[PDB]
Amino acid sequence: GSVQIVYKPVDLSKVTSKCGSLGNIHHKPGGGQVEVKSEKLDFKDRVQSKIGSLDNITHVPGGGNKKIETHKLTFR
Amino acid sequence: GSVQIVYKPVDLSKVTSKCGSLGNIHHKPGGGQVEVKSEKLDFKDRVQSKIGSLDNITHVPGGGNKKIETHKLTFR
Amino acid sequence: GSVQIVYKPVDLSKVTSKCGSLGNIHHKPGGGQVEVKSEKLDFKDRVQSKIGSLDNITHVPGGGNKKIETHKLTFR
Amino acid sequence: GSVQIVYKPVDLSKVTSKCGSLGNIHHKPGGGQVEVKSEKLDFKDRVQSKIGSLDNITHVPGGGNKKIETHKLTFR
Amino acid sequence: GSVQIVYKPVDLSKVTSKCGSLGNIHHKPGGGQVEVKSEKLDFKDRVQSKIGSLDNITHVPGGGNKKIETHKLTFR
Amino acid sequence: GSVQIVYKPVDLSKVTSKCGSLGNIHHKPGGGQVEVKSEKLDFKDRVQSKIGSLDNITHVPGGGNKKIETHKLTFR
């Protein structure tokens, strides 16, 4: 026997923003506090952690648009 | 026997925003507090964690539109 | 037998922003505090951590748009 | 008023043993095994403990007789 | 008022053993094993402990006789 | 007022052993093994400990007899 695989996907796709102005943005949080206590940490085989992380962010992109795309073909 | 597979999807798509202005934005919270107590942490084989994370975000994109897409073909 | 694979994906795609002006942005947080205590840490085989990290960010790109794309073909 | 207290207990006591011989004494046990696992011990204000104590005693006194005695008087 | 306390206890007491001979004694235990695992020990304010104590004793006194005695008087 | 205390305890007491001979004593144990693991030890305010102690004793006194005696008087 025999096999033909033809794979021809098309995007004419668009992702877009139009905006006049980003105005006035004030970010004024009051002062926080964090405390943590433990005795042992013991991590094995593919581990992530975050411990004790007081964190303030202002993020004002003039458009933050995106496209995420994937293709897979597998044959056996 | 024999096989033909003909994969031809098409996107002519638009994802869009139009906006006048972002005005006046105030992010003005009072101060928080966090406390955590433990004795042992013992993590094995593909783990995530977060412990004690007082966290303030202002996020004001001039449009934050997205398209998320995948294609897969599998043959045996 | 015999096999033919014809892989020809196409993008004429666009990811885009238009914006007039980024205005006035004030990032004016009060002062924080963080404390952490432990006695042993023991990490093995593919580990990340962050411990005790007071953190302030302003991020104002004049457009922060992106495209993420992947292709895979595998044959056995 | 007035008080007289006249405390005069008497012991003419004997505690005694008489014995011929202690013969032949064999203490011949097979070997044991002990295992213990824990993580934390945290002791406060007047504590005793024993952990993991495989223990063989032969105790062959030629008489182990005893007298245990107390006297108390209290006045207010 | 007035108080007289008279305290005149008497012992003509005896504690005794008589024995011919202590014979043949064979303390012959097989060899043992002990194992203990933990992570933290934390002791405060009047503490005793023993951990992991493989122990063998032969005690053969030619008489182990005793008297324990106490007296107390208290006045307020 | 007035107070008189007349404390006159008496012992004509004896503690004794008589024994002919202490015979033949063999203390012939097989070989032991001990293992202990931990990570932190933290002791405060009047503490004793023993950790990991393989121990063999022979004790053969020609009589080990004893007398323990105490007296207390207290006045306020």
Residue E4 CB partners (closer than 8 Å, separation 6+): D3, D4, D5, F3, F4, F5, F6
Find, in chain D, the residue whose alpha carbon is nearest to that of B41: D39
- For D57, phi then psi, to 5°, come to -125, 130
**Contact predicate A73/C73, CB 8 Å:** yes
How many whole angstroms separate alpha carbon F71 and alpha carbon D74?
14
CB A70 within 8 A of CB C69: yes
Judge: D56–F23 Cβ closer than 8 Å, yes or no. no
Quick one: resolution in A? 3.4
The answer to whether F4 and D2 have CB atoms below 8 angstroms apart is no
Amino acid identity at E10? V
Q: How far is CA E58 from the centre of its chain?
A: 16
Name the residue in chain E with its Cα closest to that of D38. Answer: E38
Amino acid identity at E38: S
- Residue numbers of C between 32 and 51 with CB closer than 8 Å to F: 39-40
Q: Are F48 and E49 in contact (CB under 8 A)?
A: yes
> Which residues lie closer than 8 Å to E63 by C-beta, 6 or more apart?
D61, D62, D63, E17, E19, F16, F17, F18, F19, F63, F64, F65
Q: Are B22 and A60 in contact (CB under 8 A)?
A: no
Phi-psi map region of E69: left, alpha, beta (phi>0 left; psi -120 to 50 alpha): beta
Q: Annotate A14-71 with DSSP letters as a single string.
A: EE--EEEE--EEEE-PPP--EEEE-SEEEEESSB--EES--EEEEE--S---EEEEEE
The structure was resolved experimentally with cryo-EM
C-alpha D62/C-alpha C48 separation (Å) is 69
Under 8 Å between Cβ of F63 and D65: no
Instruction: Using alpha carbons, list the distances in angstroms from residue D2 to B5, E44, F6.
Output: 121, 49, 17
Task: Find out whether B6 and C7 touch, Cβ atoms under 8 Å.
Answer: no
Q: Residue D9: helix, strand or coil by DSSP? A: coil
Tokens in use for A57? 């962010």
Q: What would the two tokens of residue B38 be?
A: 């433990």
Token output for B42: 């013992």
Rounded-to-integer distance, Cα A3 and Cα A8, Å: 17
DSSP E18-37: EEEE--EEEE-PPP--EEEE
Q: C10: left (phi > 0), else alpha (psi -120 to 50), else beta?
A: beta
In Å, the largest CA–CA distance within chain A is: 73
Chain A hits for B71, CB-CB cut-off 8 Å, are: 9, 70-72
Query: Token pair 């024995």 is at which residue?
Result: E19
User: What is the layout of strands, in order, in the sheet containing D66-75?
Assistant: D66-75, E66-75, F66-75
**Interface size between A and B, measured as CB pairs under 8 A:** 275
Determine contact: D22 vs chain F, CB below 8 A. yes
CB A66 within 8 A of CB B15: no
One-letter amino acid at F5 equals I
Residue of B nearest to C63 (CA): B62
